[PDB]
Design a protein around this ligand. Structure first.
Ligand code: UTH
Length: 127
């Protein structure tokens, strides 16, 4: 029972929406990040069991990953772009909180975050 359940990718009680900004986040931002050579460790939830990180979910209480973000986008889980941007930010910050500066995973995260920030800089106007 070591890993927690993953973050939800759908919810019957959460209102759903498609916006051009959310479309951009899936088509341009996530797509660009997903194919980056350092993306793979972020493409699914951290498996603290398999990775032998027994304290991971003791430290990180709001886990997030690009696999979850991808599904949320594909499922129209979000109401707005801010919610999705928040998930990306949580993913990166979690990584910086858990690992030490100069760990390879942190360098990988930093590469992805730089690219993330460049793509969301050109987030289009709503509608
Ligand atoms: C993401 C993330 N956030 O915190 C941690 C911790 C991770 C993380 C780190 C490594 C992962 C990983 N491979 C791995 C395992 C041990 C040492 C070094 C690495 C790499 C530098 C190659 C990433 C894998 C994997 O090998 O499948 C998956 N998720 C990981 N998450």
């Amino acid at each position: 029972s070591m890993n927690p359940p993953p973050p939800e990718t759908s919810n019957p009680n959460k209102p759903k929406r498609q916006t051009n900004q959310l479309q951009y986040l899936l088509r341009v931002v996530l797509k660009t990040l997903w194919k980056h050579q350092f993306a793979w460790p972020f493409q699914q939830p951290v498996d603290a069991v398999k990775l032998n990180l027994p304290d991971y979910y003791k430290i990180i209480k709001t886990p997030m990953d690009m696999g979850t973000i991808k599904k949320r986008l594909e499922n129209n889980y979000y109401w707005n772009a801010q919610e999705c941007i928040q998930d990306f930010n949580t993913m990166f910050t979690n990584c910086y909180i858990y690992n030490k500066p100069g760990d390879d995973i942190v360098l990988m995260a930093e590469a992805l975050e730089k690219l993330f920030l460049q793509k969301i800089n050109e987030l289009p106007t709503e509608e």
